[PDB]
Design a protein around this ligand. Structure first.
Ligand SMILES: Cc1cc2nc3c(=O)[nH]c(=O)nc-3n(C[C@H](O)[C@H](O)[C@H](O)COP(=O)(O)OP(=O)(O)OC[C@H]3O[C@@H](n4cnc5c(N)ncnc54)[C@H](O)[C@@H]3O)c2cc1C
Ligand SMILES: Cc1cc2nc3c(=O)[nH]c(=O)nc-3n(C[C@H](O)[C@H](O)[C@H](O)COP(=O)(O)OP(=O)(O)OC[C@H]3O[C@@H](n4cnc5c(N)ncnc54)[C@H](O)[C@@H]3O)c2cc1C
Lengths: 499, 497
């Protein structure tokens, strides 16, 4: 009875439905499992009503990002602020040494740039001759260029370069080296409300099209020119075309046994082998977020980008200087516990400079993400965990130790002391409808496979959309947005041509 | 009577020297290296100044150290004997504007950040694309500004265009003369400042029979005897006959060959004349004029925060309003036209603070065309030079926590003891710095014509005859190795049964 049934109300599904309406097609649905739209785009509220995108926050590749350009046109026409360019010079902090950024002797940023060029030459034309982990690649660089690196450069550079872990959401021993470096097509623009983007799109079509709390449990299309979809409860539907936009990791459940898994869809017939094979090419990263809200800013706003480096040792240097080769370096590196805020790099966005708000938006990676999100309810433990890194930042920013006021006790003796009032944590890895952040590469993965399979679709009536179904903007909000327009337009042309 | 030689190499620059080095390495005997000047090295020349201080007035850096083959050789040497042959002197750039002072790493201007976006803008503009017309670098920057105006602050629109111009000192061409297609490009790793490029020249020169080198002989003509013999005449009248010749004269000097008048210094008369494919290539490639000036001071009495300093050319707010009001590329290109001499603030200038990198109290400054030609044309008037650069020198000292300079060519103040200038645009054996592109230029042409040769016996080498390392010391180096190796392969058959 329906022209098109869109599964999932994330940006992919919403743009699609928005596009269909825009082209005059009627009688369409949008089945969302959650009781809200937005998918991995969620803006939450905390202390004093401040808002934060606990999901996607930035407009990437602003030079060609069509979604951004659309947002730009709007703002150009009405003068309203919808975003801010918050790129800035990064401040790097080592627990013991303090700041190490833009240093007249360490010059870490410069060797970091040679490092990147190194990775490029390494996989250039050879189909990534036996890929390895980002970690293995950095060690190869160090061994090969030690003659031209000082002791401190060999010590801090590898800890600094790991900021890239916050781009992929994966530890450097788990990340594929071939996909580590990417093409930054322009500056980034912090969205001053991705929810505003969600609402504008969400409203571009008939409200009655949306069906929240509809967990699709099975999709089938008996050869008769019709596709039949069923949600968990019991309601059934049928349409001419269907666009599946669930995340990759959820759609990956369709291959295993036990339709018991929350989110998993039952395809009949089963998704063709070219699709199932794609999942063997790894995927799914775990970018997480922790928001630190203070009463007010009493620290320096020199920069909005701050990164704390995991501890490092001088013995590491000695080992590098002495390794005869890659193997000797590998084993020689045998340090045979307990994770702390200094066991991995952490990315903090100082929102005071870019947005005025006195809070820090922090990014974390797997395996830390899963752990921190597991104890998201225990605010006390959370504060104790991050307190040491939160204190080093304040010291490096002309302030002092943080005071714990999550259980407030108004005291005049806090005038110029930073007072923490609330802590917010993401939960993507524990949410059955997301099970992580976005597609990422493990050593040996090939992202293109899935793009082709997804884009080709199960068949003429079963199409796919989402951040894991396109090449440009892969794993990005604008990527999913465009993929949603892709399928809608394809189906939109076909319908017009019939009648 | 004219002496017989297996191979004759014309020119003793690095290309010619590495050619000889390779030939000897492969057991080839009875060769010859003929050089017009009274020294070896060509565009690799280290001079002496105040108190015996040394400076490379030609090439001074090893570029692309991740893959640069000449650099790797020198590094293996230092790794074995522990002698200092080079120093990685890359640093954070200090940018200075005459009115505003330092504008680098500025928390509000963020010039370096949008400069990077510019690079990507340029990259998306050309790279991989077919049928894209070229333009000047200047024009490319104007387009960027117009298209991204909505996301740039007034001060970013004023100063970014002036900072982008540090690239002029990489090509030796003013932004309006420089082809945008050839402006940007990746560098394979950090640069390494040679602590005597002349030490590299000597090592290669000493790696082959010393009786092969014949300095002070300017070659006037090359003739191919249709019988496997090439006749070469020196100006002093000596005549030679060789099986092969490797011609490494600068591209600007070889260009004289395709013109009437054989009395110009360095010109070679070719019989038969250079094939049509070669002459014609001279239209699709040009020559830039990177130039230098060494300012020697008594002692360092200034901040050593960085070894890299760049003074931007003056800018105006009227430029901003025009960019803001422009309605399109045409209006902007038009609006940009008003109603006046050249000073040290009319173009960007690059200064290398040697005190930090080498501990020597001097500045090595790079200049570009057209300024280069004008400054070299007065290198003799030292007072005129000091007056011309005094304002930028003062501004730099102020920014490095010091005071105005004191003319001391005749306590805590900087005293200029000497000024040294380059002479490449005037030296008839150079006629400029190195190969460069003007909008519409296609360097691939010359490389192909040169690497293909005049014929089987008449070959070419030099910085203008190869892609990888084009314009660089290691490109000329490799090109020499290439022609020598080819000749060795051919002479190999001489021992087949
Ligand atoms: C912490 C974090 C930070 C990020 N930051 C950025 C950033 O700064 N910039 C950027 O560009 N991208 C960012 N991303 C990625 C971006 O959020 C995603 O690419 C994008 O939201 C994916 O859109 P989508 O429409 O495909 O799916 P949305 O999740 O992304 O999901 C599709 C919809 O399917 C629904 N669904 C799932 N299972 C079922 C079922 N069985 N039945 C019915 N409905 C179902 C879901 O509930 C969901 O609403 C970030 C992601 C994370 C996790
Ligand atoms: C100011 C300046 C700065 C530079 N800086 C760098 C740098 O930092 N890094 C880098 O890699 N490169 C740099 N270069 C470029 C580098 O110096 C050249 O690429 C390289 O030296 C060219 O070598 P060549 O052997 O081809 O020619 P050499 O000049 O370059 O010339 C070949 C030889 O031919 C001789 N000759 C000419 N005509 C005749 C004739 N008729 N008879 C006999 N002999 C003749 C000449 O006298 C000369 O010795 C710079 C160049 C200049 C001008």
């Amino acid at each position: 009875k329906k022209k098109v049934i869109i599964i999932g109300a994330g940006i992919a599904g919403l743009k699609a439905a928005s596009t269909l309406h825009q082209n005059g097609i009627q009688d369409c649905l949008v089945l969302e499992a959650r009781d809200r739209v937005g998918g991995r785009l969620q803006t939450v509220t905390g202390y004093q009503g401040r808002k934060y995108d606990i999901g996607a926050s930035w407009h990437h590749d602003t030079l060609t990002n069509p979604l951004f350009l659309e947002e730009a046109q709007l703002s150009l026409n009405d003068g309203r602020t919808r975003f801010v360019f918050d790129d800035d010079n990064f401040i790097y902090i080592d627990e013991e040494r303090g700041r190490v950024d833009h240093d007249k002797e360490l010059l870490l940023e410069i060797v970091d740039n040679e490092m990147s060029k190194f990775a490029e030459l390494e996989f250039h034309q050879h189909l990534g001759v036996s890929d390895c982990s980002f970690f293995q690649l950095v060690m190869k660089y160090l061994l090969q260029r030690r003659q031209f690196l000082t002791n401190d450069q060999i010590r801090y550079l590898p800890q600094l370069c790991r900021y890239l872990e916050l781009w992929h959401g994966l530890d450097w021993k788990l990340l594929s080296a071939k996909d580590t470096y990417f093409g930054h097509q322009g500056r980034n623009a912090f969205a001053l409300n991705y929810d505003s983007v969600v609402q504008r799109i969400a409203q571009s079509f008939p409200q009655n099209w949306l069906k929240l709390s509809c967990e699709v449990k099975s999709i089938t299309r008996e050869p008769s020119k019709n596709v039949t979809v069923n949600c968990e409860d019991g309601t059934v539907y049928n349409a001419d075309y269907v666009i599946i936009t669930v995340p990759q990791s959820v759609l990956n459940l369709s291959v295993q046994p036990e339709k018991n898994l929350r989110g998993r869809i039952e395809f009949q017939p089963p998704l063709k082998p070219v699709i199932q094979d794609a999942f063997d090419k790894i995927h799914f990263g775990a970018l997480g977020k922790v928001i630190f809200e203070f009463e007010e800013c009493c620290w320096s706003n020199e920069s909005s980008k701050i990164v704390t480096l995991a501890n490092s040792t001088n013995e590491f240097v000695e080992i590098v200087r002495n390794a005869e080769n890659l193997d000797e370096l590998d084993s020689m590196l045998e340090r045979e516990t307990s994770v702390t805020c200094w066991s991995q790099p952490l990315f903090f966005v100082n929102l005071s400079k870019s947005t005025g708000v006195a809070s820090f938006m922090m990014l974390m990676q797997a395996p830390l993400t899963n752990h921190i999100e597991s104890i998201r309810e225990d605010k006390e433990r959370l504060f104790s965990f991050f307190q040491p890194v939160l204190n080093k930042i304040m010291k490096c920013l002309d302030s002092e130790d943080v005071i714990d006021g999550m259980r407030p006790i108004e005291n005049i003796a806090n005038a110029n002391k930073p007072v923490l009032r609330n802590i917010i944590v993401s939960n993507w890895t524990r949410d059955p409808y997301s099970r992580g952040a976005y597609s990422a590469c493990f050593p040996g993965d090939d992202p293109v496979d899935m793009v082709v399979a997804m884009s080709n679709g199960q068949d003429s009536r079963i199409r796919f959309a989402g951040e894991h179904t396109i090449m440009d903007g892969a794993g990005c909000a604008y990527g999913a947005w465009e993929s949603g327009r892709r399928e809608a337009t394809r189906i939109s042309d076909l319908l017009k041509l019939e009648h």
